[PDB]
Amino acid sequence: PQEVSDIKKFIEICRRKDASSARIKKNPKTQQIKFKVRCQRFLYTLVLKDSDKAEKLKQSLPPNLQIKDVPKRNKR
Amino acid sequence: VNLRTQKRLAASVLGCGEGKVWLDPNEVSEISNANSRQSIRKLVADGLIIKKPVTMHSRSRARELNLARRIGRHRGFGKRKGTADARMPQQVLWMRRQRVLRRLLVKYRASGKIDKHLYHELYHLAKGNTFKHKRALVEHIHRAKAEKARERQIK
Amino acid sequence: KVTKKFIINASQPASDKIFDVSAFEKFLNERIKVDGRVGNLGDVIKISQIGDGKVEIIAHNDLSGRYLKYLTKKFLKKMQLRDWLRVVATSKGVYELKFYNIVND
Amino acid sequence: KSLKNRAIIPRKAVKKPLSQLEDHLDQLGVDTEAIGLRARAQT
Amino acid sequence: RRKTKAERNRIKRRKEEERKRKHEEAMKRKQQQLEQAKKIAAEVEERER
RNA sequence: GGAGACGACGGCGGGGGCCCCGGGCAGAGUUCUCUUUUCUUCUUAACGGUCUAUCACCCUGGAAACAGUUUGUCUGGAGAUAGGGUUUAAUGGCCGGAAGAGCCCGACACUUCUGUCGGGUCCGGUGCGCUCUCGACGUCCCUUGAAAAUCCGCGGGAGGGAAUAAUUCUCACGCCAGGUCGUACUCAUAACCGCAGCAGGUCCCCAAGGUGAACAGCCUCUGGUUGAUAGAACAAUGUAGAUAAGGGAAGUCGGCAAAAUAGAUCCGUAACUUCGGGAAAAGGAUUGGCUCUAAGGGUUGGGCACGUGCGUGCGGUUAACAACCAACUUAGAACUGGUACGGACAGGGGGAAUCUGACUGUCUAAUUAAAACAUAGCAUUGCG
RNA sequence: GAAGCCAGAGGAAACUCUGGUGGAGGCUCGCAGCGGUUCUGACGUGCAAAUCGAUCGUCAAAUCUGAGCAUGGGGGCGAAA
């Protein structure tokens, strides 16, 4: 797993061909949001403070990339 | 009806020993019908199988004895069983004292209370066991300072 | 100065006249200790009734809901209700008294 | 109590009989019929 | 000259303060890029084109 | 050329885990009285990123009034101290992984099928503790404590290399592939060997709390057992464990056996001696409980004048002062119970001599453990 | 409590004395382990074709121990019985 700190590099990673899926994890107790994109070798996580612009980053994300919200319970 | 399998399965499911497993003695046939870990989990959820709490081992007497020994009880000759060095090593005491004295001398030299020649002399006196503690070393330093001041006033 | 707020909700056994809220208030007034001393409440701790079988405790010290639950269990044992009434924390600072689960026989 | 050898089972893990609860409340002096203990008890 | 314990502790506090300042500045740079996300995506798409 | 790749032992320092202490939420038990109580959960992997961590190395400079410095006396004109840096080394801090998991609690639903939804999972402290690991030292040797597969660095400069662009880049990302067995269970008072489900034998890790010097003995927690033909009675003689008035070895081949001694603090300790020992020689004084007193530590913190939280130029060593934090030993005193105070447990009887083998060590598995054997030392013989 | 080391007091120096430090030894008390001294011991068609209890020797090394390998009956191995 790798942290991405640059929004430009995160956008290029999300536009990579081997980016199969992506998910959004909301941590309201720490007031933060995590964008996790699954690629071939690594899972890339971008950590942001929760905000309106942090929500509109999903609009700048590619449309063909499937993006899902992480639920409160990880049902098997 | 034999419930050995159910007791073993319930111990594995609950994550405890088989001596902590409680099977309901009024629900023996229903528990006997449970042959899977899923059925055991179902009975645990319904409360027909529970995990008993641990047996008590309190530390209150140990803590009370520790407080009494801290304030100074139970320390007599009738309570000591090891030799004095076995209870408290002279090597540990000497190492602590040397570290205290060297730390104080380092502090004094760095702050400028003593100079480097006096530091070296006091270092070798402390290694040669002149000072019993920090207070004795401090009094020796004060006496040396007074002697140096008297010599400077005379000269 | 920080202020902490506690509710003991005995509304339901109070309505069934099993739990006496006035006696419970008297017990809390005589058993709550500040700096290790009973009868040392003053303005630090205030105990009152807000109606509908509920006891209201205002504390300015570091009084704990675990201590309040411990005193409630002591009162239940004194009134011979410990084997039948349960004190459960339902929300933050609110401890509610209810019956244990009953099986029809 | 047998606390030297084992722990007491918690009260919340044991179902309490309605007859015993009614008898104890009656001995304490509570009108159990006036409060209706029958509708509360599970089956 | 030989430095004292207070001077050494001052140097240590200065180094920790510098590290904290760098971390805060990096977080603010990330926030600024988050504000400018759409232009960044346009630039990435143009570079790919 | 380096790695692989290396003894035993000693203390010291760093880190993980365990143990211990305080607060908080939640749950449980106690509750004649007392107990803001006692107990339980409160966790964070591999793999990565980043910032740091003893040794050592580099730069300035030139040290006697020698200095630096470890518990342990080593280092320095072959360049110390000081100041500033560079680096080997994480089981350290933060972040990704990762809260979505696991764990705890609650509220509903539920013939079963099946569950669903809330709340929380936090903050500190300590150490001659236990265990593993890492580091720097040190001691011992007529003893100096593997090899190979395998991987890397360097010396060399053969080749191969550009603007029709080239690239033979140990960088990042991306593509493809990874065969064969073995894997249950026991590892022992019933799974192995002893003819057996035989009180024998058979190689290893992991190892909690109290007492205490202590993986001693005794009690407890987790986890395991409650398995070894049973019931009744209490004769003789037994086996095992005990006591006994007065005398105290009169017993017996022979003090065999038992009893007595025993921990710790303090006083004191002969002949002989290879000077190292003898020695815990001998012979004495003490030890409970309670309430106090004293001593032994850590961390942080100095006034001006300018430029502006750092740089100089000064000035002062009573910080010999304040604030905060912390643990276990040692000594002294009063009071108090007593038939006992190392109250169980644990735990030398001692002395005067003689013979004998120098000592440590070894052997007759299943009747002899010894003046027997070996040993270091000494002497002889043979061999260029 | 051996060398080495520090301090103090002497001594012209060599050295001498006192207090510390250090941690040597086929040293020592003693737990496990290893061994097997004693007892009118238990057992004596036994739990056992050598076992059981108490007691005892040793316990940082000439200590204990596994696996792999070597030595084979005119032999081997033997701190030697």
UniProtKB/Swiss-Prot annotation, chain D:
Compartment list: Nucleus, Nucleolus
Superkingdom of origin organism: Eukaryota
Task performed by this protein: Involved in the biogenesis of the 60S ribosomal subunit.
Family: Belongs to the TRAFAC class OBG-HflX-like GTPase superfamily. OBG GTPase family. NOG subfamily.
Name of the featured protein: Nucleolar GTP-binding protein 1
Organism in which the protein naturally occurs: Chaetomium thermophilum (strain DSM 1495 / CBS 144.50 / IMI 039719) (Thermochaetoides thermophila)
First-to-last residue of the parent protein present: 510 to 552 of 661
